[PDB]
């Protein structure tokens, strides 16, 4: 129902796959440095669960200014 005219997924669509590979790798390194800073907090703090809760309490309010 075609031959080709104008650069479809059959031509260019693999650039979205390496885009999809980028976003998935970005979230995986998002939690990678998240518990790292929770360990960088844990030099003076306690166990990094409730310290990460403050690191997730700050995500909840969405207007921090603190």
């Amino acid at each position: 129902s075609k031959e080709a005219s104008a650069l479809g997924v059959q031509n260019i669509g693999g650039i979205f796959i390496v885009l999809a590979a980028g976003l998935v790798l970005s979230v995986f390194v998002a939690v990678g440095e998240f518990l790292y800073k929770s360990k960088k907090n844990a030099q003076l703090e306690k166990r990094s669960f409730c310290s990460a809760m403050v690191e997730e309490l700050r995500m909840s309010l969405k207007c921090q200014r603190r």
């Binding site: 005219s5 104008a6 650069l7 479809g8 997924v9 260019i12 650039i15 979205f16 390496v18 885009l19 590979a21 980028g22 976003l23 790798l25 970005s26 979230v27 390194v29 998002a30 990678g32 440095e33 998240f34 800073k37 690191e55 995500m59 969405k62 921090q64 200014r65 603190r66």
Partner: protein, 253 residues
């Protein structure tokens, strides 16, 4: 929009909406995006998150159009998002420059049929002619090797590639890829007053229309002196501009 398919266009602005919402989450999620705005500020309760849903939409469209913004993240998890999005921008625009080059380099190469010899090979474009008579029997009585091969195409294709009237032949060109053969005068009358037609090719025959007398009539030389006067004082060519040009065509526009 023609150098790209609209299936690409309908996703890529949604992908810009897609990369806007994803980067806005990670910016709120990461701790390395909270430095000091106005860095002279000597305190702790001043942490910034200049990333907004407005700004995450803005960094997408600002980077996609190859211009820049003022967003400039610091966290690696927010930098890899813009990093691959920069690698997606460079492809989709250089491909857009490629295919827009591709249309304009093949349309300029596209040369139509020009001469009678150019129609000698193309059996895709069908000749035809007018009704059996003046234009036709020149081809039949010819011995020219080009025009003989034209008659062979018309020999195999009786019953309506060979139409029987002028305006029917005008109608057959205007619908299909038909290429009508005709007396070169009445082509100038239709092409002037259609602006959808063109006289392709030159002039095959060189016969002419005359005044004419009966046999041995003594008015003939008096009319032979007449027309041969009309061409110097130009009233004959002035009447060629009288009854032929009526509209003009936007080919010059």
């Amino acid at each position: 929009l023609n150098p790209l398919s609209p299936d690409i266009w309908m996703y890529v602005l949604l992908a810009c909406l897609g990369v806007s919402c994803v980067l806005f989450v990670i910016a709120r999620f990461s701790p390395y995006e909270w430095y000091n705005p106005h860095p002279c500020n000597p305190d702790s309760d001043v942490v910034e998150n200049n990333f907004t849903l407005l700004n995450s939409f803005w960094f997408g469209v600002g980077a996609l159009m190859q211009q820049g913004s003022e967003l400039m993240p610091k966290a690696l998890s927010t930098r890899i998002v813009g990093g691959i999005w920069w690698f997606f921008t460079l492809i989709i625009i250089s491909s857009y420059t490629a295919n827009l080059a591709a249309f304009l380099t093949v349309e300029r190469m596209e040369s139509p049929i020009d001469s009678a010899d150019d129609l000698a090979k193309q059996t895709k474009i069908e000749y035809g002619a007018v009704e059996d008579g003046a234009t036709m029997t020149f081809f039949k009585k010819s011995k020219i090797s080009t025009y003989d091969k034209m008659w062979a195409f018309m020999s195999s294709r009786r019953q309506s590639v060979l139409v029987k009237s002028n305006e029917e032949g005008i109608q057959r060109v205007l619908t299909s890829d038909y290429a009508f053969l005709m007396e070169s005068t009445t082509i100038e009358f239709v092409t002037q007053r259609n602006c959808n037609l063109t006289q392709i090719g030159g002039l095959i025959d060189s016969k002419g229309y005359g005044v004419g007398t009966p046999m041995g009539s003594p008015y003939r030389d008096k009319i032979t002196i007449a027309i041969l006067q009309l061409q110097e004082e130009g009233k004959l060519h002035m009447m060629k501009e009288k009854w032929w040009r009526g509209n003009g065509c936007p080919e010059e526009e």
